[PDB]
Amino acid sequence: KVFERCELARTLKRLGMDGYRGISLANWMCLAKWESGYNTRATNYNAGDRSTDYGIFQINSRYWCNDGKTPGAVNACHLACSALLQDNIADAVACAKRVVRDPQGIRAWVAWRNRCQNRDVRQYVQGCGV
């Protein structure tokens, strides 16, 4: 499923993402936009370390989910990576929360640092009623 901007904003808010560990909803919106373009079935294979990124937040199989084919990987979210390709993003949201519970917080994703850190993210939630 590909979310429409405001649809996703409200979806994320109802899931308790606004201000989770100090990260505004707008930041989450900017992350999803640059990671998958709001596409829940987006995947990206990394040939170098044989891992893959899954879903709207492009979460990596080396540490966060299990896809059974990433050498020496762990599964911190205790989820099959398939759970990260569902149209319903509740599981992806629980895992994204787990990801930012680590040291880096939202900086865990390089894309956020490149397109959201220090830039304008308020534009992502404007007019969405959140």
CATH of the domain at 97: 1.10.530.10
1 contacts 40 by C-beta, under 8 angstroms: yes
7 classed as catalytic: no
Q: Which of 4, 49, 53, 91 is catalytic?
A: 53
Q: Which of 4, 18, 35, 67 is catalytic?
A: 35
Domain of residue 108: give its range: 1-130
- Angle of the 25-36 helix axis to the 5-14 helix axis, nearest 10: 130
Q: Classify residue 67 by burial, with Cβ atoms within 10 Å: 0-12, 13-18, 19+.
A: middle
Beta strands in the chain (DSSP E): 43-46, 51-54, 59-60
Distance CA 63, CA 103 (A): 14
Domain count for the chain: 1
Query: HSE (CB half, 13 Å, CA atoms) of 108?
Result: 20
Task: For residue 124, give both structure tokens.
Answer: 């992502």
87 classed as catalytic: no
Tell me which method was used to determine the 3D structure.
X-ray
Q: Give the resolution to one decimal, in Å.
A: 2.0
Q: Which is it for the CA torsion 34, 35, 41, 47, positive or negative?
A: positive
